[PDB]
Write a protein that binds this ligand. Structure first.
Ligand code: HEM
Ligand SMILES: [Pr+3]
Ligand SMILES: [Pr+3]
Ligand SMILES: [Pr+3]
Length: 157
């Protein structure tokens, strides 16, 4: 991660503003936008009964909120959140690939990145400071991808 200080200030101001939307926001809105980018993501996260699906989305938002909160508070050295992100990615390796209807692949996280970047634009902006969000989202989804791909490559087929 290489954010400039003006980028760090802008990201923190907009993030804390976004968190004002609710306990699990903006995480929930980010997941919902990924559902729009790719409805298969929704089919997977909402797999099962109405309750099960909603609980899974809630838990996803809860954990992502914690990881993001920690990352943003620690933009100076985020090794802890790096491990956490790789671990989260790792959790998407399932012996039966279509256990949840559609298999997980790294491309889903690229779509998630697009969804998240779109949301950041909704949260005194300049192109240079806004690029702080692009850096953060790329970092986050890259660590998720590495966690998943390293784990999936190692698993039996
Ligand atoms: C990119 C699209 C994503 C899809 C389609 C997806 C879907 C799923 C599915 C189907 C499971 C297995 C069912 C379950 O354990 O609840 C799971 C597990 C998990 N996911 Fe995701 N997820 C996505 C992104 C993320 C992200 C960004 C995070 C970051 C926090 C995350 C964190 C986790 C964790 C921690 C588990 C293990 C849950 C547990 O053991 O209770 N996922 N995910
Ligand atoms: Pr592990
Ligand atoms: Pr298999
Ligand atoms: Pr592992």
């Amino acid at each position: 991660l290489h954010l400039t200080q003006p980028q760090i200030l802008f990201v923190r101001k907009t993030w804390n503003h976004a968190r004002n939307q609710g306990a699990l926001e903006p995480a929930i809105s980010i997941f919902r936008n990924s559902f729009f980018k790719n409805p298969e993501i929704r089919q997977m996260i909402m797999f099962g009964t109405k309750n099960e699906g909603h609980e899974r989305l809630k838990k996803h938002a809860q954990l992502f909120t914690v990881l993001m909160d920690d990352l943003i508070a620690n933009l100076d050295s985020p090794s802890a959140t790096v491990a956490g992100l790789r671990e989260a990615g790792e959790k998407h390796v399932w012996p039966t690939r279509n256990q949840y209807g559609c298999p997980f692949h790294a491309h889903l996280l690229d779509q998630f990145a697009t969804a998240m970047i779109e949301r950041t634009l909704e949260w005194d902006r300049t192109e240079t400071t806004q690029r702080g969000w692009t850096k953060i989202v790329l970092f986050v989804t890259e660590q998720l991808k590495e966690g998943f791909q390293d784990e999936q490559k190692r698993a039996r087929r």
